[PDB]
Structure formats: C-alpha cells, structure tokens
Ligand binder design. Structure first.
Ligand SMILES: [Ca+2]
Ligand SMILES: [Zn+2]
Length: 392
C-alpha cells in the first residue's frame, strides 16, 4: 500500500534526450510508448530529466540539480578550474521547486543515469569538501549543491547501470563503435545520421565545453568532431566514468546515503556457449549490440582488471555483474531482495531477461510487458516508508 506521495524523476544514460527532442520519440518508452505518461495516467506523478549524455556524471549531477530546483548550472569553481571548462552553464526554470520547500523525490535511472543519481545524492547530502575548500581559499562563491545538507532524495532505482563500469570501453574500436551506438539510437527514433537537420533534434548539451552541432552539419559529421573533443578525450567524461577504472574512482567517493533507499535491476540478453565459458547475444537483442558489442563483452577477460568469467553475461552494452550495485572500490552494501526494502543499502532486485534498449522500449520485445514492469516499480516506490522502527 501507498506510504508516500513523492514524485518520480526519470534519468537517462549515455544516450538520452528531453521530451521535445527527437521529434517526440521518447527515451523512456521508445517504440513502446510514453512511460512518464503511463505513470502519470496511473496516479504516479512523474517527471523527466535531460542532461548531457556524454558528459561526466559530475556535470550531469550539477545539471540535474539546477534542472530540478532551477537556476544556472554551476559545476564548481574547483572542478571547472581542474578540467578547463565553463563554471556556469545553461539555465533552467526548475521542474520541482517543492524540493526547496521541503519535498522529496524518487529517481529512476537507466544505464549511466545510475551513476549520476548516486552522485547527485552524495553531493546533495555531503556537498564537496574540495569545492568548499576552494571557495574559502580563492574567495569565489559556492553553489548550495556543494555545501551538503540537502535531503531531496527518498530513493534511487537503477536499471542496467554499469556500477562497476563496463568492458565495452575496452574494445579496440571503442571510440568508433560508441558513436555508432548513438547513430543506432537515432535510427530507432526514425532519425538519420547523414542529414544536416536545421532543427536541433538531439542536443548533447555541451554548453560547458562550447560545443554544438553547426548549421550544415550532420550527426555523422558532428560526431567526428566530438571524438576529437574534450568530451571524448578528457577524464571529465562519461567515457572515463563508464570504464572499469573510472567507475572504481567514482565508487571511492560516491557512497550510499543511509537516508536513501536504493534499488537495483540487472539485465541480460545472452546465452552461455557450449565448450567455452563465453556468452553470446540472444535472438531478439537489438541488432547493433548483437553484432558489434555483445560478442566482445561476452568473451573479454582481463586479469589486471579482474575481468573474469563472472563479467561475461551481458545486456549487449553493460556486463550484468556490474549492475546490482557498486562493488569495485566501494563501501556500499548489497542485499538480495527478499520481500522487504531496506534503507541505506542496495536492494538487489534481480536480473531480467531484457536488453539494454528493450528495457526502456527503444528496441522492441513483445514478451516483455514494459508497462507492467514500470507500474509495478512505481507501486513499490510508493510503498516506501519515510522511517523505520526496529522490530522482531
Ligand atoms: Ca528486441
Ligand atoms: Zn566537468
């Protein structure tokens, strides 16, 4: 039964766009429909965040914070100075000013969104010592996000999140293939990559880096430029955070708040080979991933990275092992869901037989009741109690 009225906020990964983008084709729903609408139609107030898909989780967290409460994005003086990008970014009206007044939210996150949501919680709750220290030392102002003390988040749910990174980054042609994945997703939405559309269509939101698709430029061409840009070559990137070492570094500081409930969903769409311990893409997996990424994921080992047989099972984009919660370079705790949802630890909800894109409806799969999945989830989140008392 319903113990909380908090709104839900959807958060995309290394691929994603706002509701008005991509000619209305939604990331949360894809060919299946409008997940946000379904949830709202069903009594679950839901909103959608849209942040830089290729940007660092930090940047995304800063973007999210402003998008939620409103204002100009502030990445932090220290950070900015460190990485060489703008301190201030775009301005938002603010989706939920109730947060400033004392409300809370449930964040449902997909892919790299998981990492972002985690970071956002940590920043809200703890701030950034490094940003505070930098402020006092250089006499610059400080965003509230870096102070600590915010209690905006009741829960964080992650679906197909590379909490320990993904070996996808280790392919020799990764750079080219990653961008081909963006093209695939455009394809899914009925958008071509070799057309210089005048309308924006997919805004990567690279204001901080001063990058934007130029008049007369196709996504194919733009992507060529992005590959040689700081959003691809610097450590302040999704690319870095997606990596095993990257995710490790992130886990080192991004911890679970004892005040927040976390839920994790894993995804897999592979089968185990006969004579080899390798995993292969199942029938139905999205074409792109099946041909281009899944073989690699299902067969790549690396002792120095600790990539062993456990990491081979995948959803075509991310290793299933890296999905139940941060384990590499982490103090976070993960507990198998047994019926009761626990606060301050990762409630591992299991593994579902759906691929990376099928789970958000961007790739079809008729045997996966996507509406039911998200509706059940909503019901769960709504059932969370603000507080607990010990009992037998
Ligand atoms: Ca499919
Ligand atoms: Zn940055």
């Amino acid at each position: 039964s319903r113990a909380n009225d908090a709104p839900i906020v959807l958060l995309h990964g290394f691929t994603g766009w706002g509701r008005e983008e991509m000619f209305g084709f939604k990331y949360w729903g894809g060919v299946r429909g409008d997940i946000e609408q379904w949830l709202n139609d069903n009594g679950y107030r839901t909103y959608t965040l849209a942040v830089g898909p290729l940007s660092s989780n930090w940047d995304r967290a800063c973007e999210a914070y402003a998008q939620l409460v409103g204002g100009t994005v502030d990445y932090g003086a220290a950070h900015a100075a460190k990485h060489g990008h703008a301190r201030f970014g775009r301005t938002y009206p603010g989706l939920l000013p109730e947060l400033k007044r004392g409300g809370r939210i449930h964040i449902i996150a997909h892919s790299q969104g998981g990492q972002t949501a985690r970071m956002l919680v940590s920043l809200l709750e703890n701030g950034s010592q490094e940003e505070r220290e930098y402020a006092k030392a250089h006499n610059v102002s400080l965003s509230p996000l870096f102070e600590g003390g915010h209690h905006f988040v009741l829960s964080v749910t992650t679906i197909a999140t590379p909490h320990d990174g993904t070996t996808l980054v280790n392919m020799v042609d990764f750079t080219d293939r990653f961008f081909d994945l963006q093209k695939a997703v455009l394809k899914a939405a009925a958008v071509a990559s070799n057309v210089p559309y005048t309308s924006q269509v997919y805004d990567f939101k690279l204001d901080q880096w001063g990058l934007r698709r130029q008049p007369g430029e196709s996504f194919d061409q733009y992507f060529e430029r992005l590959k040689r840009s700081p959003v691809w070559t610097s450590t302040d990137t999704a690319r870095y955070d997606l990596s095993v070492p990257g995710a490790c570094k992130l886990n080192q500081w991004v911890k679970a708040s004892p005040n927040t409930y976390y839920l994790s969903f894993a995804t897999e769409r592979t089968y185990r080979g006969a004579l080899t311990g390798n995993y292969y893409p199942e029938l139905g997996m999205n074409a792109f991933s099946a041909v281009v990424c899944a073989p690699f994921l299902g067969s790549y080992r690396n002792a120095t990275l600790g990539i062993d047989d456990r990491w081979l099972e995948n959803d075509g984009i991310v290793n299933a092992f890296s999905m139940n919660g941060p384990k590499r370079c982490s103090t976070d705790r993960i507990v198998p869901y047994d019926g009761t949802i626990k606060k301050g630890v990762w409630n591992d909800m299991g593994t579902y037989n759906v691929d990376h894109l099928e789970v958000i409806g961007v790739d079809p799969n008729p045997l996966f009741d996507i509406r039911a999945f998200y509706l059940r989830l909503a019901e769960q989140l709504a059932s969370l109690q603000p507080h607990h008392h010990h009992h037998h």
